[PDB]
Ligand binder design. Structure first.
Ligand SMILES: Nc1ncnc2c1ncn2[C@@H]1O[C@H](COP(=O)(O)OP(=O)(O)NP(=O)(O)O)[C@@H](O)[C@H]1O
Ligand SMILES: Nc1ncnc2c1ncn2[C@@H]1O[C@H](COP(=O)(O)OP(=O)(O)NP(=O)(O)O)[C@@H](O)[C@H]1O
Ligand SMILES: [Mg+2]
Ligand SMILES: [Mg+2]
Ligand SMILES: [Zn+2]
Lengths: 656, 92, 51, 347, 613, 81
DNA sequence: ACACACTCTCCAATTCTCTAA
DNA sequence: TTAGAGAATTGGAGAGTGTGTTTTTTTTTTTTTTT
């Protein structure tokens, strides 16, 4: 009933919008996009606010006043999706290329309806019915920066923000599958042969049942309406849920969450388990009908997704733009990438170079193989660390946990074999049974870190057997009978029996693992803590420097940062180098020597069990990883001898 | 309760066959023992009470412990069956 | 339930448009309406029974 | 309905009723009452309604002259003998047992220091015929709990966690907080209680961190126990019951049994104990301090040339204070120290 | 209607007379205006009710007995005062029509209206009351609509309307249907302007009488409270709290036609006006405390004074007291740029004979640390001590609850092997991670551990190896910074000294009591707690070359020289030396670690490790 | 109201027992206790029930028994004996 | 307050009848 | 034989009124404390 004044007039902002769309350039930027839309080549338009800020600054420097459109569309973001759409419809250019227009049902229907009106004469339909595109905003760059650039945790999203454009940081919990949603519905009248339309915005609607057309009425033609799919307009819909990071939850509280909606080409971007920076519009969800009359003033709310930023680029997302080419060429021209990359892993930990090189080869990994008859062979590499208490095992493990884009960290005592692999939970109230994967499924196509491997129960460790070699899970329980995919590499750490390594017994007594599980690791590294007045002094000096300065001590060596390391590793995981006959003869001859030496010394104190056929493919996998890191397309004997050395060095700790 | 009849009710005035008796849980062996003692079944739960007749003769099969009989030992030693249930078979 | 049963409120798609249904929807179930049953599972009475 | 009016073999019937204004908050559960009210029905079959009643009426520290008697008792020169004689008079002999029970009932004095440390007041005794004394202690004590070693539930003596969500319940050490507790067979203690009674006795607390539960429970009580090892160290005094077999005693008991089949009284003594507990909390004199320290070092030197420890000196102090408590003397003296070390001969 | 204006005038006179409330308004306004140009303080003020009594009794009793008729006009007058004072020009669209007035709160001298949930009675309805109890439940936060703004497409006019509900206002009005208008009076189609509309936060809680006051094992009683705007989420379950607000009723009570025959009563609530906690830990320093703390720090031997002031009632064990003080100060936690983490907190273990004050000394830390949790070794399981699953929801254990604090474990030897191994992560990585059916999460646990144990043979046997006497794995003993062995050696003068000491202790009498009634220099513990708080917050000593020169030499000599040392020596020993030096420098309130601190830390570690100085 | 069930001795072999419900009015209330074996005389009566018709899908009426009567010391000679 | 089921009322569309050219 | 003026019977347009709606097992997988 009452009314107020406000400082904003939308006519001026509309004029600013139509000038911005036709003038700005980094021809003008957005007219190219609209030409692509007119040609039916492009489905969505992404508006940058950095462009609007730049446009405002340039117009100001030319000596003219201008409204601050950036804050205007951040404050009340919902209204401006309509203004931009109307501006785009007004200014849309004509097509550059032939289209085959007859493929469109709506074109035929509207042309015939226009012809009917033309003959009769001897808005028509809602404009939403013919918008072939979607539109989204992208927030301000923080380095140019405003609230939309500064992430909020899910607790900080108060009721003040309803209607604004914001950014949220958290973990996704669940994702729904896609289903259609109506925007404009179409009908047909049987008797008078005329079509009518209806637009839907709310969650529910009442369909039409009477032809209220004036011509149909004046003929007293009380015809019947029927719905039609063939001329209705749908749009893809998907719903998700986001939840705050566990390490940001205050003490004694339960984590909170938000509901996210996604429409258009943005669909099926999110996935469960992702750490992500979502940005969108935060809105309420009103009730409808009789429910509204007695629901009260408490409003449900959700977030309209607009743009998504992931923290870590998955390896599958790689493509060699020249920007990445320029940076990998730095490492390629500098040379000796193997040693530099190995040294760069956890610079704050002294020594341990061979272990780091092995873990780099874990990060790269071998080549998948699939024989013509259907047999397939594992590509992943498995590694284990066995050593005395207090030699930076857990520290180095958790350091590698950072580099990998997909990865999880787990400890032996806190883990169930079910939850480590997959569980059949009677979760809903409806007594339904549903499968939900465990840690090794979440680490699919990634690394799984299992600390305190010796404390895990003997029965539960047997669950890992299938996943290690076959890279799959099989379950046959109540109401569920399926197989899941787990293409994960395992890294594990443990102390020997009795804690500190006992020289009185053989290595196999100290290791205390069964044969079937000991074989499944490609490398098992044995590291012992033996005092030495010379070495302890150097280690103490290094650690004291690190505690003093927060920086590793350095005179010659500069580590590569993790981002460039990730780029180089991602580029290296695409090569698939092949073997050759000369290399094949060499490795074939080595394998015989290994098994003969194993047979000679099964009785000996220097025994480590018997070499199985799985030790040959370990050599091949390590050789192919080394071939990958030098960006070759051909395995070389140089790689093979290095692979053999890296396997030999693991046992030298036994000899003081 | 669903009340619907069990196996012993269907075998009233008949032969009830139990195969691999030794694998049955003790918590159910006691139920068969209680029914066999009286030839009667009782229900009392959720406000519903009932008594039913179970005039059924039992024929059972079992495995010796360890899979092979021991001639050195009594049948009680060989068989994983409690003494009250063993006392109520006419023939072994 | 979907028909005008006195004293009870209404409760894969059915059929509609009938007078009694209004805007409601009606489905059906299959069952068998039998007419007789036959099973196939004192000594004097027994002897009289035999041929 | 009244328990002595129900027909045999039936569960008792009951009614629901209402009251307002001054008739509210006038009664508590378990009390026998008489009621006047209108009997009527209310809505909540066919043409059927529930009955109820509207109520219109319901029916259901010391003086000076008391403490004068207690003061007269306090100045009697043979009060200790009188109180010992009054405890389980039917039981023959066992003088030191009765003296120890007097000391257990009276207790020491609680203290709190500037740095926050807290000093215990309670007394603990073990007895190795014996069934009667625990019942007597239950009757005479102001507050008392009686139990056998297995306890009233799965909580046992101390406490346990049970399960469906988990919960926690306390045994007959938490429930007796602030009073006395007597255990009928200490050897039948369960496995968890064997370890938990260490904290229950030394700290006067029970603490649990299991299945997401994280709480601490109060166990401020004096324990009497009997049985028939290292667990004897927790008690302040231990003794073994002794018997005598006079035929006249048994004949007298039998004659009394036939009579039912065909010195200070309990209530007065209980009230006197309550008064003494409320009014006085004495302190050691310096002479007692010198005496006790000299005796302590003497015993340790004698054992060395041939163990006593501070945890037993602090028990002797509590026994001394409890002995001084009877006279209502504000200071303890060498008279009490001598009787304390004399009674300390558990062995 | 006219009476509303006069009450506004009278409260305006009150606000002009007592000027200390004008300063509050202006200070909040200028603070908010400053940072806006770059957190924001609420538009709320607390008034002393005694000032209102002394100014005008009629207004005081009107507020205190008829709040629905007196609180709104006073709040209106406060909003007028704050609005007339100068404010930033050119407000934005949302600021122009916020519908956000200032709000009041009260303190002091409620008299008869100070109550508890048991005694709150129907006579007190519509009065302003204060209650005390424990929070038991809290609802989720929800937004609530109070105003909406609309833009008319054709005319270019902005319209608006307001909404009300029974819990939003002290006075009573016709309820509103929560419908958004779609069309203008003149037929123009409307659009809703989110971001110009106003929503507020809402939360319900429940408060119960304290268990200490429950009679006869009877059922306890409780009340529901309503909170909104600034008061949301300032409490959690288990908090002891004192709440101020108006006690009111709601609803039709079944007189709108119902089957109950109106035997059921009306609903009731307290509308939260102000909330205060109860101490049942933290202290705030005054200027005099800063002066005294800085002046005391320049004594030659502050470490001896402070260490000997810890548990003066316990004779002897100087080194353990000094170690406990250094534990309470702690080191400095490091986070390197690549995300790597280096531990800072110190763990201590002590094992010894019976009766040698292990539990008594362990009890002292529980009553001087700001956050402390205590447990017995056999009364706790691994999942209970770290974390557990429930319903999926994950529930924290004891080590997770004490995050930045200390945890005390008595009877450590009785803990089973299956329970102990859960602790190996928490004492170095300072995190708890679970991987069970339907859950995978990581939790933080940054605490320091102090614990006590008994030797294997019941008393320490010098004639057997320390490993034989101490049945724990080497990987666990490595995680304790300092391991102390203590015994009850019989000696004449030692026994005499200890016995005389405890006898002197037992002759204490508190100040306010006559004899027989039932209940160097040492700084007081209430001052020592302030000293520890100030030193832990305000000074962060950085390391120096001169300290490093000592640390490296001591480490390399201690590791390599062959001796009968009683603990394994590893890379964690160097960290122990660095932590102890940093903590001792922190006791000194030095901005940097010096040679003296490293020397003292080495001398303490040598005593604990090699058993002799 | 009282629920009445067939005595186990009367039930034929291999069949479950049947049930009926009895209404007791003014003088007859609390004449019998649970578990007793009882004999009843009364009128057999029926009425419409919507839920039965809805669930079964046939015009099926429910039936009740209205009881009219319900059925389940020494002399000097015994004392002298 | 928002779709439905059911009731009530008035008005004009329609057919039937009579009269005269 | 057409047609036009007057009367009687019927249909359904449409206006009105009242109404209803939100809201003890038994079997099977998994974690936890208890003997
Ligand atoms: N070469 C090294 N460089 C730097 N720090 C080291 C080195 N070796 C050991 N440390 C330190 O040793 C400490 C313990 O490391 P950690 O990874 O927990 O050892 P661990 O072998 O896993 N101990 P445990 O789990 O008992 O076997 C950390 O503070 C490391 O900084
Ligand atoms: N200076 C002291 N030295 C030893 N004990 C003392 C000292 N001062 C007091 N005590 C008393 O000694 C008793 C034993 O203390 P406590 O802390 O329980 O020893 P403990 O090491 O825990 N024995 P335990 O529980 O078997 O491991 C308490 O009653 C203390 O009051
Ligand atoms: Mg480790
Ligand atoms: Mg102790
Ligand atoms: Zn039509």
């Amino acid at each position: 009933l009452p009314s107020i004044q406000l400082p904003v007039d939308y006519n001026n902002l509309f004029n600013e919008i139509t000038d911005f769309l036709v003038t700005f350039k980094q021809g003008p930027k957005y007219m190219a996009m609209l030409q692509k839309v007119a040609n039916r080549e492009l489905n969505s338009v992404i508006i940058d606010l950095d462009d609007i800020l730049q446009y405002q600054n340039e117009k100001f420097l030319q000596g003219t006043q201008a409204d601050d459109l950036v804050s205007a569309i951040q404050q009340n973001a919902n209204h401006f999706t309509e203004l931009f759409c109307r501006a785009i419809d007004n200014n849309m250019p004509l097509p550059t290329k032939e289209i085959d227009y007859k493929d469109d049902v709506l074109d035929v229907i509207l042309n015939q309806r226009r012809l009917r009106n033309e003959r009769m004469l001897s808005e028509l339909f809602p404009p939403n019915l013919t918008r072939r595109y979607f539109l989204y905003f992208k927030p301000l760059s923080q380095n140019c920066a405003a609230i939309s650039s500064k992430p909020l945790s899910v607790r900080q999203i108060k009721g003040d923000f309803l209607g604004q454009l914001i950014t949220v940081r958290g973990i996704i919990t669940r994702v729904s599958d896609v289903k259609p949603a109506v925007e404009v519905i179409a009908y047909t009248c049987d008797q008078c042969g005329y079509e009518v339309f209806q637009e839907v915005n709310s969650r529910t609607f009442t369909p039409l049942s009477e032809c209220t057309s004036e011509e149909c009425s004046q003929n007293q033609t009380k015809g019947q309406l029927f719905m039609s799919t063939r001329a209705s307009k749908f749009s893809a819909f998907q719903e998700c849920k986001i939840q705050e990071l566990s390490q940001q939850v205050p003490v004694g509280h339960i984590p909170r969450s938000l509901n996210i909606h996604v429409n258009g080409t943005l669909v099926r971007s999110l996935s469960p388990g992702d750490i992500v920076d979502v940005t969108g519009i935060f809105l309420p969800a009103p009730y409808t009908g009789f429910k509204a009359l007695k629901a009260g003033l408490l409003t449900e709310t959700y977030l309209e997704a607009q743009f998504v930023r992931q923290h870590k680029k998955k390896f599958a997302s790689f493509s060699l733009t020249s920007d990445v080419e320029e940076r990998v060429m730095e490492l390629i021209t500098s040379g000796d990438v193997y040693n530099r990359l190995a040294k760069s892993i956890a610079p704050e930990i002294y020594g341990n170079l061979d272990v780091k090189k092995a873990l780099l080869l874990l990060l790269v990994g071998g080549v998948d193989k699939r024989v013509g008859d259907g047999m397939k062979i594992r590509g992943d590499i498995n590694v284990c660390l066995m050593g005395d208490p207090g030699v930076a095992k857990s520290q180095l493990l958790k350091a590698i946990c950072k580099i990998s884009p997909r990865g999880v960290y787990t400890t032996g005592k806190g883990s169930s074999g079910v939850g480590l692999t997959a569980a059949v939970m009677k979760d809903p109230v409806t007594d339904e049974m549903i499968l939900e994967g465990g840690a090794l499924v979440l680490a699919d196509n990634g690394i799984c870190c299992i600390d305190e491997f010796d404390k895990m129960d003997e029965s539960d460790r047997t669950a890992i057997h299938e996943v290690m070699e076959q890279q799959t899970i099989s379950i046959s329980k109540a109401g569920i009978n399926t197989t899941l995919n787990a293409r994960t590499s395992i890294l594990a750490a443990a102390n020997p029996l009795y804690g500190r390594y006992n020289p009185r017994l053989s290595p196999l007594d100290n290791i205390n693992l069964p044969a079937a599980l000991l074989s499944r690791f490609d490398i098992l590294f044995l590291m012992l803590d033996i005092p030495s007045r010379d070495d302890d002094e150097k280690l103490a000096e290094h650690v004291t420097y690190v505690h003093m300065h927060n920086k590793q001590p350095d005179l010659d060596f500069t580590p590569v940062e993790p981002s460039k390391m990730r780029e180089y590793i991602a580029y290296a995981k695409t090569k698939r180098p092949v073997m050759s006959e000369a290399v094949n003869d060499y490795v074939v001859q080595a394998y015989i020597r290994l098994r003969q030496d194993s047979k000679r010394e099964m009785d000996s104190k220097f025994s480590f069990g018997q070499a199985t056929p799985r030790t040959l493919l370990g050599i091949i996998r390590l050789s192919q990883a080394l071939a990958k890191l030098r960006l070759a397309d051909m395995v070389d004997i140089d790689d093979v001898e290095e692979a053999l050395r890296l396997v030999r060095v693991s046992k030298e700790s036994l000899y003081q | 309760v669903v009340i619907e009849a069990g196996a012993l009710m269907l075998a009233d005035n008949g032969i009830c066959c139990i195969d691999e008796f030794d694998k049955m849980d003790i918590s159910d062996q006691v139920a068969i023992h209680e029914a066999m003692e009286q030839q009667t079944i009782s229900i009392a739960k959720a406000g519903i009470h009932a008594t039913l007749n179970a005039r059924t003769s039992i024929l059972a099969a079992a495995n010796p412990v360890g899979g092979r009989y021991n001639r050195k030992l009594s049948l009680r030693g060989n068989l994983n069956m409690t003494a009250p249930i063993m006392s109520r078979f006419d023939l072994f | 339930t979907q028909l005008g049963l006195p004293g009870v409120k209404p409760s894969n798609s059915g059929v509609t448009g009938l007078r009694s249904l209004g805007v409601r929807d009606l489905t059906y179930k299959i069952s068998f309406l039998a007419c007789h049953v036959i099973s196939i599972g004192d000594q004097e009475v027994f002897l009289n029974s035999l041929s | 309905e009244i328990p002595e009016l129900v027909p045999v073999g039936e569960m008792p019937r009951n009614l629901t009723m209402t009251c307002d204004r001054y008739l509210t908050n006038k009664v508590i559960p378990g009390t026998r009452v008489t009621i006047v009210g209108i009997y009527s029905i209310y809505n909540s079959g066919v043409a059927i309604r529930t009955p109820y009643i509207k109520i219109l009426g319901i029916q259901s520290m010391f003086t000076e002259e008391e403490e004068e008697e207690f003061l007269q008792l306090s100045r009697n020169p043979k009060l200790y003998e009188i109180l010992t004689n009054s405890i389980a008079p039917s039981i023959f002999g066992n003088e030191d047992i009765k003296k120890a029970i007097v000391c257990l009932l009276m207790g020491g004095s609680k203290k709190i220091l500037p740095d926050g440390m807290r000093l215990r007041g309670d007394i603990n005794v073990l007895l190795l015929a014996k069934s009667q004394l625990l019942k007597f202690v239950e009757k005479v004590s102001p507050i008392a709990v009686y139990t056998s070693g297995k306890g009233s539930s799965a909580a046992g003596l101390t406490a346990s966690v049970q399960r469906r969500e988990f919960y926690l319940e306390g045994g007959a050490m938490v429930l007796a907080d602030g009073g006395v507790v007597c255990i009928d067979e200490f050897d039948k203690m369960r496995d968890e209680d064997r370890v938990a009674i260490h904290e229950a006795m030394e700290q006067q607390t029970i603490s649990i961190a299991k299945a997401g539960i994280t709480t601490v429970l109060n166990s401020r009580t004096s324990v009497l126990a009997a049985a028939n090892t290292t667990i004897l160290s927790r008690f302040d005094m231990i003794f073994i019951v002794k018997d005598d077999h006079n035929e006249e005693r048994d004949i007298s008991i039998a004659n009394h049994v036939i009579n039912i089949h065909t010195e200070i009284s309990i209530e007065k003594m209980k009230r006197y104990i309550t008064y003494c507990r409320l009014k006085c909390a004495p302190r050691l004199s310096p002479q007692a301090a010198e005496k006790l320290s000299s005796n302590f070092v003497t015993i340790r030197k004698q054992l060395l040339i041939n163990p006593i420890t501070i945890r037993q000196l602090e028990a002797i102090i509590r026994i001394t204070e409890s002995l001084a408590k009877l006279e209502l003397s504000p200071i303890a003296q060498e008279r009490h120290v001598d009787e304390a070390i004399r009674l300390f001969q558990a062995s | 209607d006219a009476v509303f204006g006069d009450r506004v005038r009278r409260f305006q006179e009150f606000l002009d007379t007592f000027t200390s409330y004008r300063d509050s308004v202006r200070s909040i306004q200028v603070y908010n205006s400053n940072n806006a140009a770059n957190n924001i303080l609420p538009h709320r003020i607390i008034i002393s009710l005694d000032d209102l009594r002394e100014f005008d009794r009629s207004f005081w009793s009107g507020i205190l007995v008829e709040p629905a008729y007196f609180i709104p006009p006073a709040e209106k007058a406060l909003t007028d005062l704050a609005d007339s004072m100068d404010d930033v020009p050119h407000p934005n669209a949302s600021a122009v029509s916020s519908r956000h007035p200032w709000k009041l709160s009260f303190k002091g001298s409620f008299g008869a209206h100070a109550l508890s949930p048991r005694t709150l009675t129907a006579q007190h309805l519509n009065k302003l009351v204060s209650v005390e109890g424990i929070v038991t439940k809290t609802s989720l936060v929800r937004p609530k609509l109070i105003r909406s703004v609309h833009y008319a497409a054709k005319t270019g006019r902005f319209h608006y309307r307001d909404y009300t509900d029974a819990t939003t206002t002290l006075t009573t009005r016709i309820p509103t249907p929560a419908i958004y208008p779609t069309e203008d009076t003149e037929g123009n189609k409307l659009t809703t302007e989110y971001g110009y509309s106003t929503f507020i936060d809402h939360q319900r809680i429940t408060v119960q009488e304290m268990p200490e006051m429950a009679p006869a094992g009877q059922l306890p009683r409780s009340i529901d409270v309503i909170l909104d705007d600034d008061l949301v989420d300032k409490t959690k379950p288990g908090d002891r709290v004192n709440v101020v607000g108006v006690f009111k009723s709601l609803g039709a009570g079944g007189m709108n036609q119902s089957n109950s025959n109106t035997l059921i009563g009306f609903k009731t609530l307290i509308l939260g006006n102000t909330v205060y906690p109860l101490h049942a830990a933290r202290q705030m320093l005054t200027d005099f405390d800063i002066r005294n703390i800085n002046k005391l720090s320049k004594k030659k031997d502050i470490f001896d004074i402070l260490s000997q002031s810890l548990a003066p009632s316990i004779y002897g064990h100087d080194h353990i007291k000094k170690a406990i003080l250094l534990m309470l100060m702690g080191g400095v936690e490091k986070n390197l740029e690549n995300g790597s983490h280096l531990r800072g907190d110190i763990n201590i273990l002590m094992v010894g004979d019976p009766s040698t004050a292990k539990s008594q000394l362990l009890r002292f830390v529980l009553n001087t640390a700001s956050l402390a949790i205590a447990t017995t070794g056999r009364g706790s399981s691994g999942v209970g001590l770290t974390a557990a699953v429930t319903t999926r929801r994950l529930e924290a254990g004891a080590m997770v609850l004490a995050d930045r604090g200390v945890v005390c474990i008595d009877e450590f030897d009785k803990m089973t092997d299956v329970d102990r191994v859960a602790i190996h992560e928490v004492m170095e990585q300072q995190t708890v991670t679970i991987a069970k059916a339907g859950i995978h999460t990581t939790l933080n646990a940054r605490c320091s551990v102090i614990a006590a144990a008994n030797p294997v043979f019941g008393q320490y046997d010098v004639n057997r190896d320390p490993h034989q006497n101490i049945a724990l794995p080497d990987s666990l003993l490595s995680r304790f910074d300092l391991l102390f062995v203590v015994t009850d050696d019989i000696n004449e003068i030692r026994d005499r000294s200890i016995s005389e000491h405890v006898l002197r202790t037992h002759r204490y009498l508190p100040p306010g009591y006559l004899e027989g009634e039932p209940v160097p220099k040492l700084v007081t513990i209430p001052f020592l707690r302030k000293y520890v708080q100030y030193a832990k917050e305000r000074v962060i000593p950085q390391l120096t070359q001169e300290a490093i020169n000592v640390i490296v030499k001591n480490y390399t000599d201690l590791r390599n020289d062959d001796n009968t040392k009683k603990s394994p020596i590893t890379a964690r020993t160097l960290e122990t030396l660095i932590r102890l030096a940093t903590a001792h420098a922190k006791v000194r309130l030095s901005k940097t670690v010096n040679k003296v601190d490293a020397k003292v830390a080495a001398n303490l570690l040598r005593f604990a490790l090699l058993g002799e100085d | 109201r009282v629920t009445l069930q067939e005595a186990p001795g009367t039930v034929p072999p291999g069949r479950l027992p049947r049930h009926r419900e009895v209404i007791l009015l003014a003088d007859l209330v609390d004449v019998s206790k649970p578990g007793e074996e009882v004999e009843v005389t009364g009128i057999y009566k029926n009425n419409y029930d919507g839920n039965l018709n809805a669930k079964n899908g046939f015009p099926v009426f429910a039936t009740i028994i209205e009881a009219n009567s319900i059925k389940r010391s020494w002399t000097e000679e015994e004392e002298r004996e």
